[PDB]
Design a protein around this ligand. Structure first.
Ligand SMILES: [Ca+2]
Ligand SMILES: [Ca+2]
Length: 279
């Protein structure tokens, strides 16, 4: 399949080179996989989700995404137009309030929730969780992310937007999950992207167009935008049977475009998520 005039990030994950415009992907498109978007919620009614999104848990008064961030991330995972894995099932877990903030205890609880809830869902091709969030280092947040991964969920987390080593942020610094840096359309590390030895992979994160609340769309930037590209890619690859939740991060790294990025500090991987699609 080919989506013409796709958002640059989708084009980039299906090309060995920057600057293309078509997103090439196998039509299976993540069908049969599930992605939990642990964030400010998902506006599931957005037409771009085609009924494939639903809220499954909120830690606040409402499950509505009153912010937009979670809806944006969800759209990069799995919306029709903006999504990597266009046929995946999306499940929203609202751990962040409508200002985009959440206490660590709530974020942990939301991770534990996913680890259990997945057992109640039909996800024959496997389960991914996308965590476009983080704060300062917390062993308890890291341990929650590790548990979620151990439970059989492909966990992708944002590296953070501090232009610093991700070792000082969580859950970015948890080794066992897939920690995602951000790049821009010119294959530079995004100016805000964290870096460091704990990064596993980069994905497109600067000026990413996706869904927004009120049935709208907008372009925003962050490691939060790179993370759902990787989460979506994992779902896509899992549907194709090329990898499993436990191994998807390493598979993505092994099959990534290598050395294409600039302003990568020594010691940080130079790997950009790539679907290796061949018609
Ligand atoms: Ca290249
Ligand atoms: Ca890792």
């Amino acid at each position: 399949a080919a989506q013409t005039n796709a958002p640059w990030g989708l084009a980039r994950i299906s090309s060995t080179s920057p600057g293309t415009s078509t997103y090439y992907y196998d039509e299976s498109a993540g069908q049969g996989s599930c992605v939990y978007v642990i964030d400010t919620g998902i506006e599931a009614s957005h037409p771009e989700f085609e009924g494939r999104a639903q809220m499954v848990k909120t830690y606040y008064y409402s499950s509505r995404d009153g912010n937009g961030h979670g809806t944006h991330c969800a759209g990069t995972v799995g919306s029709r137009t903006y999504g990597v894995a266009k046929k995946t099932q999306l499940f929203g877990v609202k751990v962040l309030d409508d200002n985009g903030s959440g206490q660590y205890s709530t974020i942990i609880a939301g991770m534990d929730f996913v680890a259990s809830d997945k057992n109640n869902r039909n996800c024959p091709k496997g389960v991914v969780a996308s965590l476009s969030l983080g704060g300062g280092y917390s062993s308890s947040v890291n341990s929650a992310a590790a548990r979620l991964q151990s439970s059989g969920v492909m966990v992708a987390v944002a590296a953070g937007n501090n232009n610093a080593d991700a070792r000082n942020y969580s859950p970015a610094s948890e080794p066992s999950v897939c920690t995602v840096g951000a790049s821009d359309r010119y294959d530079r590390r995004s100016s805000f992207s964290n870096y460091g030895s704990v990064l596993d992979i980069f994905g497109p994160g600067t000026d990413i167009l996706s869904t927004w609340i009120g049935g709208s769309t907008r372009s925003i930037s962050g490691t939060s935008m790179a993370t759902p590209h990787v989460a979506g890619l994992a779902a896509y690859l899992m549907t194709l049977g090329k990898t499993t939740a436990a191994s998807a991060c390493r598979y993505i790294a092994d099959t990534a475009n290598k050395g294409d990025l600039s302003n990568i500090p020594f010691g940080t991987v130079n790997l950009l998520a790539y679907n290796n699609y061949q018609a």
